[PDB]
Design a protein around this ligand. Structure first.
Ligand SMILES: CN(C)c1ccc2c(NC(=O)Cc3cccc(Cl)c3)cncc2c1
Ligand SMILES: [Cl-]
Lengths: 305, 297
């Protein structure tokens, strides 16, 4: 019993965190095998940031300009290349602690663990979701650039995010491990704003199913709804449209609890209309959208209470 | 910017998790040097049950490797299994007992294999609101003190209400609990006042000032209000501990107490503080200072 926001054990990722220095800038890098991955803006000055020509700035750099530190040891850079917004520094030593890994690009609504680092030293781990507006609501200070987001499903570490910058609203933007940003963002100081955010409907529904599994049924009602009628209501509360894929994905949870997906949608519609009324669902006074259907089946039991 | 429930990096602890089997029971153990620590319930008159056991009855697994048990003893509710091999991944550690309100990270394990990490607080009623299934027994709670891992909790059981009970690493339970199947209930819980105040200071640091007012209160008047809302009494130590946060934001502790007093009587009024519609008590003053400064491990 019990439901918590849980992160993946950060051990396999901690053994990869290094400190990357180029001139005055210092941020984090991910040392996998003989390559260190870090944001390409490490080559930039604060002045360069408005309209930087990265290809022009990188052609001016030599391997000895990049100082890489792995613990108390200095790694020797023997090559460098750029892949989209990530800088790949070839090093002379392969990481002996390199885990089994994959570079994966995630879709909005997907969750992951963030190992926040400063000076190549991990300071904390937290769980978070890729928002529909492609931003992440993280907890980052200056020096955290290069911190990575991952999932450790089964035994392989799937790197899905690398931190790059904080937007004016306090939310964060970054790339997959191939250097492609999530969202319409650029690694530039130009006026960039996060688009209006929405609630991940499929995740709130999964979390309502987890509440039913933990014995909380107070929000359930005798109504059902059409998918179209639920989306018309949900749109007005700034909720993401629920698609037929989302419904299919909630199938296992529907079967386990005995509550049809469109039956749970009717409970959600009612919760949106009435509010919590002094009550909580899984110790929360708000509808939680940072647990995917997969997370709920992973954390929750099989014998419903 | 941003405020999250953050756990310490679990790496130093993961290298210690082992699987302990005795008969049909299987739970987790903590392998530090040549000793494996686990709940004694893996084997009631515990001394009578333990005198009947031999070293080869305890099967200990560290990854794919089997560890050879060469001795066994009991310290309170923890079973200490002496093993032939010293853990090469043993970190610098201390066994510490924590006080209610203090927070820690939990590395939840099943079959000696870590599955997740989360942050939580020791409640005033000595229970922890964790996330555990069957097989999680022996999972440990810890903090990282610079470079030294401070083991403070070991999971033993789930109470009928869904909350959890356990011991420090010396086998002394937190709270009036015992390690057996009997009618045990968690006492009425209270809100950790010093932690809510620290979290209100973290909200001010993140630009959330709507709850601030021009008013102040006496410590005595605030505690009369705290007693009425099931809040733990705020002591002069708590006030002194909130000193650095008071200085950084420019809001006196008893000024922030009059903000909490108004939030207790009137509520949030459709508003949220740090994305929360409830007053959060699982961040200590030090946790707030650590997350708003960038201390690394
Ligand atoms: C201390 N504060 C205000 C900061 C400062 C900086 C933060 C940060 N880094 C940057 O933004 C660096 C940068 C600036 C301009 C363009 C790009 Cl692509 C990158 C990351 N995460 C959080 C932060 C928080
Ligand atoms: Cl995905």
């Amino acid at each position: 019993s019990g439901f918590r926001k849980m992160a993946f054990p950060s051990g396999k990722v901690e053994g990869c965190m290094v400190q990357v220095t180029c001139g005055t800038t210092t941020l984090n890098g991910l040392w996998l095998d003989d390559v260190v991955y870090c944001p390409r803006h490490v080559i930039c000055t604060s002045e360069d940031m408005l309209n930087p020509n990265y290809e022009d700035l990188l052609i001016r750099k030599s391997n000895h300009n990049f100082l890489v530190q792995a613990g108390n040891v200095q790694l020797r850079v023997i090559g460098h290349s750029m892949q989209n917004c990530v800088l790949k520094l070839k090093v002379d030593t392969a990481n002996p602690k390199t885990p089994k890994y994959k570079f994966v690009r995630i879709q909005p609504g997907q969750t992951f663990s963030v190992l926040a680092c400063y000076n190549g030293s991990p300071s904390g781990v937290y769980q978070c979701a890729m928002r529909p507006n492609f931003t992440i609501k993280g907890s980052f200070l200056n020096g955290s650039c290069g911190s990575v987001g991952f999932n450790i499903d089964y035994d392989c570490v799937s790197f899905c995010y690398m931190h790059h910058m904080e937007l004016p609203t306090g939310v964060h933007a970054g790339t997959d491990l191939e250097g492609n940003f999530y969202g319409p963002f650029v690694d530039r100081q130009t006026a960039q704003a996060a688009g209006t955010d929405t609630t991940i409907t499929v995740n709130v529904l999964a979390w309502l199913y987890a509440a039913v599994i933990n014995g909380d049924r107070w929000f359930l009602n005798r109504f059902t709804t059409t998918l179209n009628d639920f989306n018309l209501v949900a749109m007005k509360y700034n909720y993401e449209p629920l698609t037929q894929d989302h419904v299919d994905i909630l199938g296992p949870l529907s079967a386990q609890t005995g509550i049809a997906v469109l039956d749970m949608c009717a409970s959600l519609k009612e919760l949106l209309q009435n509010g919590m009324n002094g009550r909580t669902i899984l110790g929360s006074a708000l509808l939680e959208d940072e647990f995917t259907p997969f997370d709920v089946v992973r954390q929750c039991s099989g014998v419903t209470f």
